[PDB]
Design an enzyme around this catalytic site. Sequence first.
Site, PDB file in Angstrom:
ATOM      1  CG  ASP A 226      33.258  44.333  33.290  1.00 34.30           C
ATOM      2  OD1 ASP A 226      33.182  43.697  34.370  1.00 34.30           O
ATOM      3  OD2 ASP A 226      34.157  44.139  32.422  1.00 34.30           O
ATOM      4  CB  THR A 227      30.832  45.043  38.862  1.00 30.21           C
ATOM      5  OG1 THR A 227      30.827  43.611  38.718  1.00 30.21           O
ATOM      6  CG2 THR A 227      29.400  45.556  38.755  1.00 30.21           C
ATOM      7  N   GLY A 228      33.660  44.405  37.208  1.00 28.38           N
ATOM      8  CA  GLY A 228      35.027  43.944  37.237  1.00 28.38           C
ATOM      9  C   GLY A 228      35.997  44.766  36.415  1.00 28.38           C
TER      10      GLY A 228
HETATM   11  O1  LIG Z   1      34.666  33.919  27.950  1.00 28.70           O
HETATM   12  C1  LIG Z   1      33.520  34.738  27.671  1.00 28.70           C
HETATM   13  C2  LIG Z   1      33.062  34.348  26.263  1.00 28.70           C
HETATM   14  C3  LIG Z   1      33.839  36.247  27.746  1.00 28.70           C
HETATM   15  N1  LIG Z   1      34.858  36.591  26.791  1.00 28.70           N
HETATM   16  C4  LIG Z   1      34.784  37.511  25.839  1.00 28.70           C
HETATM   17  C5  LIG Z   1      35.949  37.633  24.864  1.00 28.70           C
HETATM   18  O2  LIG Z   1      33.783  38.229  25.756  1.00 28.70           O
HETATM   19  C6  LIG Z   1      34.193  36.577  29.216  1.00 28.70           C
HETATM   20  O3  LIG Z   1      33.356  36.561  30.111  1.00 28.70           O
HETATM   21  N2  LIG Z   1      35.423  36.917  29.540  1.00 28.70           N
HETATM   22  C7  LIG Z   1      35.833  37.291  30.893  1.00 28.70           C
HETATM   23  C8  LIG Z   1      36.369  38.701  30.885  1.00 28.70           C
HETATM   24  O4  LIG Z   1      37.572  38.916  30.688  1.00 28.70           O
HETATM   25  N3  LIG Z   1      35.498  39.658  31.091  1.00 28.70           N
HETATM   26  C9  LIG Z   1      35.893  41.064  30.984  1.00 28.70           C
HETATM   27  C10 LIG Z   1      34.888  41.822  30.098  1.00 28.70           C
HETATM   28  C11 LIG Z   1      34.571  41.112  28.784  1.00 28.70           C
HETATM   29  C12 LIG Z   1      35.781  40.978  27.901  1.00 28.70           C
HETATM   30  C13 LIG Z   1      36.539  42.285  27.657  1.00 28.70           C
HETATM   31  C14 LIG Z   1      36.025  41.777  32.321  1.00 28.70           C
HETATM   32  N4  LIG Z   1      36.999  41.153  33.162  1.00 28.70           N
HETATM   33  C15 LIG Z   1      37.794  41.914  34.117  1.00 28.70           C
HETATM   34  C16 LIG Z   1      38.656  41.050  35.016  1.00 28.70           C
HETATM   35  C17 LIG Z   1      39.739  41.579  35.916  1.00 28.70           C
HETATM   36  C18 LIG Z   1      41.150  41.237  35.477  1.00 28.70           C
HETATM   37  C19 LIG Z   1      41.497  39.760  35.351  1.00 28.70           C
HETATM   38  C20 LIG Z   1      38.709  42.905  33.391  1.00 28.70           C
HETATM   39  O5  LIG Z   1      39.322  42.666  32.350  1.00 28.70           O
HETATM   40  N5  LIG Z   1      38.868  44.076  33.980  1.00 28.70           N
HETATM   41  C21 LIG Z   1      39.768  45.067  33.379  1.00 28.70           C
HETATM   42  C22 LIG Z   1      39.094  45.916  32.304  1.00 28.70           C
HETATM   43  C23 LIG Z   1      39.910  47.010  31.679  1.00 28.70           C
HETATM   44  C24 LIG Z   1      39.897  48.308  32.436  1.00 28.70           C
HETATM   45  N6  LIG Z   1      40.905  49.135  32.395  1.00 28.70           N
HETATM   46  O6  LIG Z   1      38.967  48.533  33.176  1.00 28.70           O
HETATM   47  C25 LIG Z   1      40.374  45.882  34.531  1.00 28.70           C
HETATM   48  O7  LIG Z   1      39.698  46.358  35.451  1.00 28.70           O
HETATM   49  N7  LIG Z   1      41.673  46.118  34.416  1.00 28.70           N
HETATM   50  C26 LIG Z   1      42.411  46.890  35.422  1.00 28.70           C
HETATM   51  C27 LIG Z   1      43.362  46.002  36.194  1.00 28.70           C
HETATM   52  C28 LIG Z   1      42.841  44.839  36.985  1.00 28.70           C
HETATM   53  C29 LIG Z   1      43.941  44.159  37.791  1.00 28.70           C
HETATM   54  N8  LIG Z   1      43.780  44.152  39.253  1.00 28.70           N
HETATM   55  C30 LIG Z   1      44.765  43.915  40.118  1.00 28.70           C
HETATM   56  N9  LIG Z   1      44.617  43.906  41.442  1.00 28.70           N
HETATM   57  N10 LIG Z   1      46.008  43.665  39.691  1.00 28.70           N
HETATM   58  C31 LIG Z   1      43.169  47.998  34.703  1.00 28.70           C
HETATM   59  N11 LIG Z   1      43.197  49.347  35.196  1.00 28.70           N
HETATM   60  O8  LIG Z   1      43.798  47.751  33.667  1.00 28.70           O
HETATM   61  C32 LIG Z   1      36.878  36.305  31.442  1.00 28.70           C
HETATM   62  C33 LIG Z   1      37.196  36.596  32.883  1.00 28.70           C
HETATM   63  C34 LIG Z   1      36.482  34.850  31.235  1.00 28.70           C
HETATM   64  C35 LIG Z   1      35.226  34.353  31.881  1.00 28.70           C
END
Ligand SMILES: *O[C@H](C)[C@H](NC(C)=O)C(=O)N[C@H](C(=O)N[C@@H](CCCC)CN[C@@H](CCCC)C(=O)N[C@@H](CCC(N)=O)C(=O)N[C@@H](CCCNC(N)=[NH2+])C(N)=O)[C@@H](C)CC
Lengths: 99, 99
Positions: free
Chosen positions: B25-27
């Site tokens: 997950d690059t995101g």
């Molecule tokens: O919808 C499909 C079926 C699928 N859903 C599920 C339940 O599997 C899906 O693709 N969901 C997408 C999704 O949320 N994908 C995430 C992984 C799979 C589910 C856990 C990854 N998405 C990123 C998006 C960025 C934030 C909106 C994510 O959640 N990144 C987090 C991960 C947690 C972590 N600590 O690494 C992240 O990086 N969080 C940090 C903060 C980010 C905020 N950035 C700024 N500038 N404020 C953190 N340190 O906490 C969704 C997208 C639907 C397609």
Amino acid sequence: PQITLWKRPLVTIKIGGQLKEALLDTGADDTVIEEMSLPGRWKPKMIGGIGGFIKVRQYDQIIIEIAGHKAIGTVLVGPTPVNIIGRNLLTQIGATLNF
Amino acid sequence: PQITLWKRPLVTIKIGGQLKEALLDTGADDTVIEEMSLPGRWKPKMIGGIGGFIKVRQYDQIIIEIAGHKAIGTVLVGPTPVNIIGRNLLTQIGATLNF
Ligand SMILES: *O[C@H](C)[C@H](NC(C)=O)C(=O)N[C@H](C(=O)N[C@@H](CCCC)CN[C@@H](CCCC)C(=O)N[C@@H](CCC(N)=O)C(=O)N[C@@H](CCCNC(N)=[NH2+])C(N)=O)[C@@H](C)CC
């Protein structure tokens, strides 16, 4: 380009005549953009991830320019904390993960 | 390898002697795994996703294999919907995004 992952992979996009910043997210099935107007009909969707689900509007056949590369596909619009380019458009620009 | 994005980029990981599936997950800034037992002390962390925030347990210097590549680093444990490998470990296995 080759994008390293020391920092968040943020790029400039153009959508609906607007420039935005967005995250390239291989962990997202779909592309999700903050509130904005788009043309055409839409239908509601719920999408989930860490923290649970949000409700979005689904628009089809939307053109996006992603770091200079055009793609067309479905775009979801709603209260996302981050604009996200997901796999449905990453595939179209030829993005791969390499290691 | 080169991993395309037509399907979810799921790989096998090994943590605690057990094989699990996880999403590259690059995101994701960090690596987050579903409830399991890890050794040592943990520290608290709050993380955010698409739906809001959750509390997780932070374990440091955990030995983990990702698609056959060895890494040693921080692993967060909590109520994530899916196991995700984030940039903290993607960088250790030399992963890049390319298009
Ligand atoms: O919808 C499909 C079926 C699928 N859903 C599920 C339940 O599997 C899906 O693709 N969901 C997408 C999704 O949320 N994908 C995430 C992984 C799979 C589910 C856990 C990854 N998405 C990123 C998006 C960025 C934030 C909106 C994510 O959640 N990144 C987090 C991960 C947690 C972590 N600590 O690494 C992240 O990086 N969080 C940090 C903060 C980010 C905020 N950035 C700024 N500038 N404020 C953190 N340190 O906490 C969704 C997208 C639907 C397609």
